[PDB]
Amino acid sequence: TTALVCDNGSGLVKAGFAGDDAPRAVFPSIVGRPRHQGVMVGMGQKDSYVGDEAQSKRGILTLKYPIEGIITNWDDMEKIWHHTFYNELRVAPEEHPTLLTEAPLNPKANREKMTQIMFETFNVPAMYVAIQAVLSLYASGRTTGIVLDSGDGVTHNVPIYEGYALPHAIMRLDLAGRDLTDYLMKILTERGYSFVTTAEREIVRDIKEKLCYVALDFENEMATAASSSSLEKSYELPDGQVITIGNERFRCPETLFQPSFIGMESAGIHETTYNSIMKCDIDIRKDLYANNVMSGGTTMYPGIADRMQKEITALAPSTMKIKIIAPPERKYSVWIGGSILASLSTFQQMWITKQEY
Amino acid sequence: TALVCDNGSGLVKAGFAGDDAPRAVFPSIVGRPRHQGVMVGMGQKDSYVGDEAQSKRGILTLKYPIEHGIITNWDDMEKIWHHTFYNELRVAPEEHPTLLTEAPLNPKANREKMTQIMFETFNVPAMYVAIQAVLSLYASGRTTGIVLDSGDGVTHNVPIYEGYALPHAIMRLDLAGRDLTDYLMKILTERGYSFVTTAEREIVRDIKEKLCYVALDFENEMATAASSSSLEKSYELPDGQVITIGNERFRCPETLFQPSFIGMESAGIHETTYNSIMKCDIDIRKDLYANNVMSGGTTMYPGIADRMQKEITALAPSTMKIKIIAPPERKYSVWIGGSILASLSTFQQMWITKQEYDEAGPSIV
Amino acid sequence: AALVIDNGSGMCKAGFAGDDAPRAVFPSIVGRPRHQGIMVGMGQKDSYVGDEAQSKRGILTLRYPIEHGIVTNWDDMEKIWHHTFYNELRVAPEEHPVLLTEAPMNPKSNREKMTQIMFETFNVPAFYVSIQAVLSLYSSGRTTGIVLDSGDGNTHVVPIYAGFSLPHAILRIDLAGRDLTDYLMKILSERGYSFSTTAEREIVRDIKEKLCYVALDFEQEMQTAAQSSSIEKSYELPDGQVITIGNERFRAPEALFHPSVLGLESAGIDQTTYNSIMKCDVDVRKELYGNIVMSGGTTMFPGIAERMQKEITALAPSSMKVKIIAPPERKYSVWIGGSILASLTTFQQMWISKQEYDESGPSIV
Incomplete structure (x- = not known):
């Protein structure tokens, strides 16, 4: 049979099989457990729902999102993971080796219970969590470097050398993708709009994908936006009106570097990168600086790479090659790694089988 | 064995399960005598239900026990059911499971009290309310859509997807079969006539059923009324006064699209559908727009389904497939569904018995 | 003196600066005839606004x-201002500093439309929107406070600092004073009533403002109202009949905290105050927790301030001093806050001159 891979974050799960280079079941890892007695505008009333229908169920x-970067x-979680192998992947666990990913710092107590559940509640013949x-x-084709992994919930720096992310230096920052939407939401609200419910919120996030960018220098950008129309990037709102936005476009994701816009002082994604490279020892630093690697739903933001080329150089002593690598695949690269890695013949004898457990 | 008995603002429809068409059928009327005299055949009487009452209507x-589908x-009502079992079906309630129907916005109390009367007086073994x-x-056989239920007393938009009816999407609009007939009273009397006595009081109802039209394109049919076409339709009274109904004939069904014709400053059926489909979820919508099912006595009008076809199609996204499903049977569908459901090989363990009823009390049903 | 006009979606409130209570109190309604006549009873003015329009809502x-x-x-809107001057206060705008309002989350064009009309039609010498x-x-006496300005049409929660x-x-x-009545219209009807038309719906409005209450616990009170007639309140309908209103008296306020009963995909007013504090920075949160300005007529129903105190200490930290601030004059709160602000000798320099409007346009506010 072939193995399965299921990447989990605070927002989008990716599930699929090993062998394929592209993830199969990408969905909102949202469950909806009954609040009180309520009936859907559509469906009758029934129990907990995972995914897109729960978003349409919102008031009954x-x-929950079972994962806040940690379970x-x-x-x-299990609720989703049945819905994964079954409703998404259309198969059964007993035939199927399965890899779940995880956010690096994950406490031992989580890992032990994660192993249990999937061998028991599910009964996969062997499994891996990674x-x-x-x-x-x-997935970036490297023995070394430093990934800046940032998506819907948590943001990360892992200074990797020859198989290992340097644990003590895996810098985390909990300002990431929802934090960006809920800022972008509040800005437009202040201007005389208001979303709250279901459709309109999601629209604001789609705006984040289309209009938003981090500019290299925030003060020169702060100026041009407020000066001249170039930046005034429109969108056609579902009622009809064009919201024009110039400053707010870059203003919103600037929270990654200057977080103080929402109200956050702990060290920005840039400064966390300087300090993880440092938080290691000292020689490996170069091919960390020269392989700053971006992955995850947030690193999708345009301009972000050029900016980090400034943002690290500013502090890094002159003779370090700063280079920021960002795959086009980026939102799925943890799965794309995990499929190829799961499929590895060399790795077969590391599939913890149901006998050792 | 099982029974189905639909309680209406106009008519009760009763029978057994699995029969195609209702066994007992009677006007929800309860009369009381105004004159102390013997109707030679009976002794003294209490009250008259149905056609006993609709015969003796003058004396x-x-009283209309079920205003607009709410008891x-x-x-x-207890007397109506007292009439239902014994006189009409001619049998004893206690060996017969009994499915009844309810209003789309029907209060708990009304469901529970109909069921109190059901067991605690008539002693039926098992009952259902639907x-x-x-x-x-x-009766349209599907699990999902938006159901335009217009009978005598009430007009409704009930969306459903999978089995159960959608309480906050159910629209109700209290202008329906009655409001239309007694409007056809005014416009035809306005046309130089008068339904003075009992059977042409009935003829203003009769004309409404048989002769009337929801003309498609009313405007350019108003032109056709004014340029005078042979659209005119005589019909005789009990005397030989042939009455000529032409235009009003369509100018009365027109009230299910504009409530202005009687005097309600509100949106016609067509819109209220579209609005309920708006208030319903996005992902469901393609079902609702294509499973818009109409029923109740008033939906029988020649042209009403075509008209509904165009009205919501003029409101929907053009990427959408629309369908208004008007069955040839629609004036009894509420009972056909009941009958089929009671006769279902899977329904027996939803036949709510006295065992379930006693131990739990009225709130089980 | 100046003028201060809170243009409320139910009731607008005009007057001068420095007065304690609003001089023109009136519903924001414009009545225009279906067809203007020439005489009283037919309708002889092209526009009737507020109270006069209310007595005349037939034509x-x-x-x-x-x-x-x-x-x-x-x-x-302009029609309403034109009334307020000559008809109500009995004044002339060009003689006047006017101060009007807007609800937070009011868009630029919406302000700017207003800001122009005051300075181009009404040619007022000084104007401020607020x-x-x-x-x-x-009006509270604070620089800083979270504010549940639950109006009639809009409930806005603001964390000021x-x-x-x-x-x-x-x-x-999006539920507030109106959405409350129209729930109570549904649920009194459920207890065997007919409230549908404006006259009848206004009876529902008055029941709400008089007899109603917000239970401190929804359970204890459901059980009690299903038993002891202490909850029951007698009410004289203006026709003559005394009726009694029962558990609807709290379940209609309980829409604010459980929108679910209406079938709204929202969380309660209480839960929103919490999310509005938590969406602010850690320091200001302690004062927001202690300085919840309850404001507006919707926050007037018996028990509501005390109820908010309860649920909000359970939402808030175990170490928190939650405090509700509740004015008895909260129904005109915005107006008194305006009145002070217009009258303020200091704030006089913020009176936007007719000149700077003519050089800068409406965008300056």
């Missing part, structure tokens, strides 16, 4:  |  | 020109 089911809610950004650097 | 005091009095528009969807 | 077409504190229909919440905080509103967390809920 309380909506918070255990039953909810450190996300190491599989990004691997 | 009686008639408005339980005294008169939401009128769903049972039309179930 | 007129009533509309409320302001929705969720956003004026949709700028014709009718944020209903920052004015509620000014040092005079600035942090719109950052201005979360809005």
Whole structure:
């Protein structure tokens, strides 16, 4: 049979099989557990729902995201993971080796219980759980470097050398993708709009994909936006009106570097990168600086790479080659790594089989 | 063995399960005598239901027990069912499971009290209560759509997807079969006539059923009324006064699209559909726009389905497939669904018995 | 003196600076006839606004020109101001500093349309628009406070700090004073009543403002209202009949905290106050927790302030001093906050001159 891979973050799961280079089941890892007695405008009333229908269910089911970069809610996770192998992947666990990824710092207590559940509640014949950004650097074709992994919930720096992310220096920052939307939401709200419900919120996030960018220098950009129309990038809102936005476009994701816009002082993605490269020792630093690697739904933002080329150089002593590598695949690279790695013949004898457990 | 008995603002429809068409059928009327005299055949009488009442209507005091599909009095109602089992079906309630129907917005109390009367007086073994528009969807055989239930008393938009009716998407609009007939009273009397007595009081109802049209393109049919075409339609009274109904004939069904014709400053059926489909979820919508099912006595009009076809198509996205499903049977669908459901090989373990009823009390049903 | 006019989506409130209570209190309604006559009873003016329009709602077409504190229909808005001057206060705009309001989350064009009309038609010498919440905080006696300006049409929650509103967390809920009545219209009807038309619906409106209450616990009170007639309240209908209103008296307020009963995909007013504090920075949160300005008529129903205190200490930290601030004059809160602000000798320099308008246009506010 072939193995399966399922990457989990605070927002989009990616599930699929090993062998294929492209993830199969990408969905909102949202469950909806009944709040009270309520009936859908459509469906009758029934229990917990995972995915897109739960988003359309919003007022009858309380909506959880089981993963805040770490697994918070255990039953909810399993709820998804049945819906994964079954409703998404259309197969059964007993035939199927399965790899789940994870956010690097994941506490031992999580890992032990993660192993249990999938061998028990699910019964996969062998399985693996694996450190996300190491599989990004691997999907990036590298023995070394430093991934900046940032998506819907948590942001990361892993200084990797010859198989290992330097643990103590795996810098985390919890300002990431939702933080960006809910800022972009509040800005437009202040201007005399308001989303709250379901459709309009999601529209604001789509705006984040189309209008938003981080500019190299925020003060020269702060100026041009407020000066002249070039930046005034329109969008056609579902009622009809064109919201023109010039400053707010770059203003919104600037929270990665200057987080103080929402209200955050702990070290920006740039400064975290300088300090992870440092938080290591001292020689390997170069091919960390020269292989800053971007992955995850947030690193999708345009301009972000050129900016980090400034943003590290500023602090890094002159003779270090700063280079920022960012794959086009980026939102899935942890899966794309995990498929190829799962499929590895060399790696067969590391599939922990149901006998050792 | 099982029974199905649909309670209406106009007519009760009763029978057994699995029969195609209703066994008992009677006007929801409860009369009381106004004159102390013997109707030579009976002794003294209490009250008259149905056609007993609709015969003696002059000497009686008639009362409408179920205003608009909501049971408005339980005294008169208990007698209606007291008439239903014994006189009509001619059998004893206690060996017979009994499915009844309910209003789309029907209060708990009304469901529970109909069921109190059901067991605690008539002693039936098992009963069910089911939401009128769903049972039309179930006579249309599907699990999903938007059901335009217009009977005598009430007009409704009930969306359903999978089985159960959607309470906050159910639209209701209290202008329907009655409001239209007694409007056709005014415009035809306005046309130089007067329905003075009982059977042409009935003829203003009769003309409405048989002769009338929801003309498609009303405007350029108003032109056709004014340039005078042979659209005119005589019909005789009990005397030889041939009455000529031409234009009003369509100018009365026109009220199910504009409530202005009687005097309600509100949106016609067509819109209220579209609005309910708006208030319904996005992903469902393609079903609702294509499973718009109409039923109740008033939907029988020649042209109403075509007209509904165009009205919501003029409101929907042009990427959307639309369908208004008007069955040839629609005036009894609420019972056909009931009958089929009671006769289902899977339904027996939803036959709510007295065992379930007693131990739990009224709130089981 | 100046003028201060809170253009409320139910009731507008005009007057002068420095007075304690609003001089023109009136519903924001413009009535225009279906067809103007020449005489009383037919309708002889092209526009009747507010109370006169209310007594005359038969020939007129009533509309409320302001929705969720956003004026949709700028014709009718001007009409309302034109009334307020000559008909109501009995004044002339060009003689006057006028101060008007807007609901937070009012768009630029919407302000600018207003800001122009005051200075181009009404040619007032000085004009200020203001944020209903920052004015509620000014009526409270604070620089800083989170504000549930739950109006009739719009419930806006604002977390103000040092005079600035942090719109950052201005979360809005779409139920409010009207959405409450129209729930009570449904549920009194459920208890065997007929409230449908304006006359009948206004009876529902008055029941709400008089007899109603917000239970401190929804359970204890459901069980009690299903038993002891202490909850029951007698009510004289203006026709003559005394009726009694029962558990609807709290379940209709409980829409605010459980929108679910209406079938709204929202969380309660309480839960939103929490999310509005939590969407602000850690330091300001302690004062927001202690300085919840309750404001507006919707926050007037018995038990509501105390109820908010309860649920909010359970949402807030175990170490938190939650405090509700509740004015008895909260129904005119925005107006008194405005009144002070217009009268302020200091604030006089912020009176936007007719000159600077003619050089800078409406964008300066």
